[PDB]
Amino acid sequence: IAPFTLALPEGEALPLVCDSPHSGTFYPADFGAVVAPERLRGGEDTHVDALWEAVPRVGGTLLAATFPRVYIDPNRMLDDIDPAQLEGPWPTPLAPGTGLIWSNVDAPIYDRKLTVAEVQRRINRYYRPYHAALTEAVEGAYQRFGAVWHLNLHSMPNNAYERLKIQSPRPLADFVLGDRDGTTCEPGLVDLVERELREKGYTVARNDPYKGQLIAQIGRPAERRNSLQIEIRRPLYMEEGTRERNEGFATLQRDLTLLTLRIAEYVRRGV
Ligand SMILES: [Zn+2]
């Protein structure tokens, strides 16, 4: 019933703070959707938190959502709501891009408009705790170390280009690294992650199709605060229909453990 898990290091801590906002699979009773949960499981970045289990084993902190992102999405801003999805007016200005509250799975989730009150309660019970935990980890790290490296962790469907409105002359990479075109993370870490993953045989794209807003807010490298969004092509570890770990899960998790150890070393040397 806890809105997040928070895996802390057993030994020496380092300022590597990692969050998996989309891996939650515990659906609230008060969802009130008209669509079968089997249809909603779509937008889950399933198992992404288990893929990165090494993080606390190497001194990092791993935060993960237990609620589904299709219920409320912690990687969106609180004003990323379309007025037309609400029954009634929102008390403050909205700036949709939408979203924070999913409205459909395909071009519908509900047979009605959500109340202001209902969305507010989602925000209080699930989003705010999750984000307070992320803040506490990021600011705690920075306060002790004078730097922080934040990884925002995801997976993506094979047709991510189709689902976004993009026609790419290139295939979708195995890993996409978003740092808002080179502005939210100091370059040496993006270079490290890219090189280590390509050496293990994975394809890596930067900022294509995912460039990273939370990431712009956390990642200000001139203040020694760094943020990188990392996206994993789902077929690499699960079966997109059943959502179930496949034969690639084990090997990918192993590769990410080894990558994480390398990042921990890079972080310790950067403090
Ligand atoms: Zn995601």
Integer Cα distance of 109 and 179 in angstroms: 31
Q: Are 172 and 156 spatial neighbours (Cβ–Cβ below 8 Å)?
A: yes
Question: Looking at residue 100, which CATH number applies to its domain?
Answer: 3.40.630.40
> Do the annotations mark residue 47 as ligand-binding?
no
CB contact at 8 A, 69 and 22 = yes
Query: Which residues, in sequence order, are CB contacts of 93 under 8 Å at separation 6+?
Result: 79
Q: Any binding-site annotation on 131? A: no
Q: How far is the CA of 269 from the centre of ligand 1 (A)?
A: 29
CA-wise closest residue to 231 among 174, 180, 191: 174
According to DSSP, the residues that pair with 2 across neighbouring strands are none
Per the structure, the complete domain to which residue 271 belongs is given by 1-271
Q: Phi first, then psi: what are they for 45, rounded to 5°?
A: -85, 65
CA 44–ligand 1 middle distance (angstroms): 7
User: How far does residue 138's CA lie from ligand 1's centre (Å)?
Assistant: 19
Amino acid identity of 261? L
Method: X-ray
* Cβ atoms 221, 188 nearer than 8 A: no
User: What span, in angstroms and rounded, lies between the C-alpha atoms of 210 and 85?
Assistant: 25
Structure tokens at 162: 């189709």
Domain count, the chain: 1
45 is in an annotated binding site: yes
What is the resolution of the experimental data for this entry, in Å? 2.0
Show the beta-strand stretches assigned E in 54-147. 61-65, 86-87, 114-115
- Which residue numbers come right before each break in the chain (C to N over 2.5 Å)? 97, 98, 107, 212
Residues in the chain: 271
Cα of 209 from ligand 1 centre, angstroms: 13
The two three-digit tokens of residue 177, written as one number: 């690294």
Cα-to-centroid distance, 245 and ligand 1 (Å) = 17
Question: How close is the Cα of 154 to the center of ligand 1, in Å?
Answer: 4
Can you list the alpha helix ranges (DSSP code H) found in the chain? 37-40, 48-51, 116-122, 128-145, 160-163, 187-199, 214-218, 248-270
Q: Which amino acid is at 13?
A: A
